[PDB]
Amino acid sequence: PSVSNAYLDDEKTVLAKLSMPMTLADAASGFTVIDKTTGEKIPVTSAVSANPVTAVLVGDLQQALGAANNWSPDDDHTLLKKINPNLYQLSGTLPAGTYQYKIALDHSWNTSYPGNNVSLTVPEGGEKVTFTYIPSTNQVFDSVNHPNQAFPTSSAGVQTNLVQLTLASAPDVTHNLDVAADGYKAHNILPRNVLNLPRYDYSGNDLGNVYSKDATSFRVWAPTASNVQLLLYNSEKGSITKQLEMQKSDNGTWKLQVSGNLENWYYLYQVTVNGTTQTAVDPYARAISVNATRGMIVDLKATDPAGWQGDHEQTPANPVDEVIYEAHVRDFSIDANSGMKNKGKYLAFTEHGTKGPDHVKTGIDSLKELGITTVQLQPVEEFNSIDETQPDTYNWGYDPRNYNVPEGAYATTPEGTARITELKQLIQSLHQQRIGVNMDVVYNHTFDVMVSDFDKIVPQYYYRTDSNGNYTNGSGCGNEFATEHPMAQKFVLDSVNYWVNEYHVDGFRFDLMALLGKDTMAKISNELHAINPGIVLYGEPWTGGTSGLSSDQLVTKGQQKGLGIGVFNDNIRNGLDGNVFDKTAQGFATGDPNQVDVIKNGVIGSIQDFTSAPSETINYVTSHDNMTLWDKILASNPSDTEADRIKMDELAHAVVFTSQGVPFMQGGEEMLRTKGGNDNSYNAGDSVNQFDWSRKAQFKDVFDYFSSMIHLRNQHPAFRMTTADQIKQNLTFLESPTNTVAFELKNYANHDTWKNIIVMYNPNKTSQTLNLPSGDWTIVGLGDQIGEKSLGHVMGNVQVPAISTLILKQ
């Protein structure tokens, strides 16, 4: 029989879990707290149940109290409010008459009180009535039937296995604190939400190491530590060179200035918390030993490549001006046929004039040819899954370990600062070609807990835990980062600022962004847009498991409104090729006849679905997750010809490229990249994941079609309206045949040089006709030909070939 967990969640509040329930008594209810460091006893002044109570007044009085319907237990319009932990009340004014009521719990009729319906007569003229529910006894009162009934201010009687304790004094968060109750084995009290308080909130910009020729200063946040020492090493693998005591400083930080030139030195923090001492790599380290056994102190200036002072950012006026191309650094160039020398490395992106099979352009020259504006790199923040001494193992990188360090496996060497210079050279190279770089970042969880630097410095606090003391599984990977904790939020904010400032990155794709929370994303957006309003920010509006964060804060679709961030649009994705759960499901592009309305909603940049502005939707059909489109269409359309499947693939992407919003594509779709049907290729290796550049030679017509669509969008801002009002003003759907979508962009929309543009998607296996508005129309997109030039003129009516997109202009 034990207290199984205990948290200090406020200066004088402990949340304790018991291995079996108890009935609470007066005051302390048998609970004791001792500071085992000083021997001092701290009196428990109050003990209440921490379990929430959802008690709703139900009956035929519910409408009269503002509810939509009577007898409705799930209508929180008449939810009772907490007066004290053992007193819940609701007041409201009722018109004269006879009523009936109960109190229903937990939004159902499973449990309601009392035994029977209660009769209530409201006298002439009406009356304000108070309704009361007492958790300890399940008693239900109203102020008419029981005018001055007495209400308790004790939780005695309440049965619970989860208790909230109030303490007489605030314990020292660095001390060994214990809680016990009569008949229950004692447990340590771990500081948790107490650390949220302003006294433990450090707002300086100097966490980590700050290097100069004359001295390096170190600062780490460790508010519960009894001691922190700095361990300095003058070699990557050799024994400790110098061990130094750090000094307790502001708001739970420890600091130290070390005189001398520490360039290329290595270090660790040695942190003593309560009953144990461990070493940790600085979460703010900018470089590491091989495999991050140690942090490395470096001169960042010396890492800049030549010409870096001339580098210019690639951030357009609005996110709808980007065409985003997702690529993994290894996949891009690892194939023997890639024509790039630095195979699987950052530096492959610096190579001009590279050629593949049958003289196709590869590498950056291929990106240039294709017309995409922005490369989204799969994770390049240091992750755990690749041993840097074996840098050719394969991983996507969704297991981050050192957030402020470039992944070593993609550098020519993991030694020292080559990884910094080479990633900067990648970014520099792309910028020289007017291509931006968005980083896929994984702030929502770490590779593991307990052995993580976070848990070795401030036990559990960087992660979400439940009332049992277990790590919650928001990411699906065993843990989730607690952005509702101010210093954890600060860690993320400092990190994204560092990547923009030091590496000149142009934006971020937030893995499982819903988990980061609205308040956090608003702050990220505000801070980064203050640096550069053109920075583009977006991410996945879903989780990977049940999250500890309240649903009101999760950034699901609709929650991004007005924040200056976008969400991946799984509605248009499912509409294009079928629900993600069913491999054989068809969608609009591939034969399903029931998706027209979904597609129309995507065409208008989702402004009637979940966005306030078209910049808030990232439109797409595939990504690194699940199947490539070529593989997906083989699964859903196995009986269709190669030629028709090519048309379907092109059509799905044509919708993405011609819809209002932010178009995104999985890199390699323009050459029908195949994973051999793999639907989760995170560690599957190069035969599965690589860019096989022979497929660009094989499917050059497909590549050219994609390029022609992308260049058309780049040239025509009517496709890239920036507000909902512009879209409502300028975009009209035209009457068209069953299972087709046709629209017109009017009025030289958004400063287009074409007065009217018509687009029609025809997914059907026969040609379809469209009635045209008045005047002469110039065909610019017909069948396999898309461009700026006249393909012929028509009036009145026009035929759209099977499985294709028609584009006309006037």
Among all residues, which ones are annotated catalytic?
A: 511, 540
Closest CA to 760 of 734, 728, 796, 785: 734
Could you count the other beta carbons within 10 Å of the beta carbon of residue 35?
Answer: 17
Residue 296 CB partners (closer than 8 Å, separation 6+): 264, 265, 266, 267, 285, 286, 287, 288, 289, 416
Handedness of CA 240, 242, 248, 254 (dihedral sign): negative
CB 737 within 8 A of CB 705: no
Residues forming a β-bridge with 98: 121
In b/e form, how buried is each residue of 461-493, taking b as 16+ CB within 10 angstroms? bbbbbebebebbbbbebbbbbbbbbbbbbbbbb
In b/e form, how buried is each residue of 734-758, taking b as 16+ CB within 10 angstroms? bebbebbbbbbbbeebbebebebbb
Residues forming a β-bridge with 101: 59, 118
CB 266 within 8 A of CB 235: yes
Cis before 114? omega within 30: yes
Helix (H, G, I), strand (E, B) or coil at 79: strand
CA dist 292 → 105, 209, 281, 554, 644 (Å) = 52, 16, 7, 32, 50
CB 466 within 8 A of CB 9: no
Residues forming a β-bridge with 42: 33
Residue 226 CB partners (closer than 8 Å, separation 6+): 174, 272, 273, 274
Q: Could you give phi then psi for residue 395, rounded to 5 degrees?
A: -155, 145
Residue 605 in tokens = 């940049």
Q: Could you give phi then psi for residue 783, rounded to 5 degrees?
A: 55, -125
Residue 8 CB partners (closer than 8 Å, separation 6+): 14, 171, 173, 177, 189, 190, 191, 192, 193, 194
Q: State the greatest distance between any 2 C-alpha atoms of the chain, in Å, as a whole number.
A: 93
Closest CA to 633 of 689, 698, 588, 601: 588
Could you count the other beta carbons within 10 Å of the beta carbon of residue 417?
Answer: 19
Q: Is 710 exposed, middle or buried (0-12, 13-18, 19+ CB in 10 A)?
A: buried
Q: How many angstroms separate the CA atoms of 463 and 449, rounded?
A: 8
Q: How many angstroms separate the CA atoms of 82 and 51, rounded?
A: 12
Helix (H, G, I), strand (E, B) or coil at 182: coil
* Residue 415 Ramachandran class (φ > 0 left, ψ -120 to 50 alpha, else beta): beta
Token pair 């700095």: residue:
230
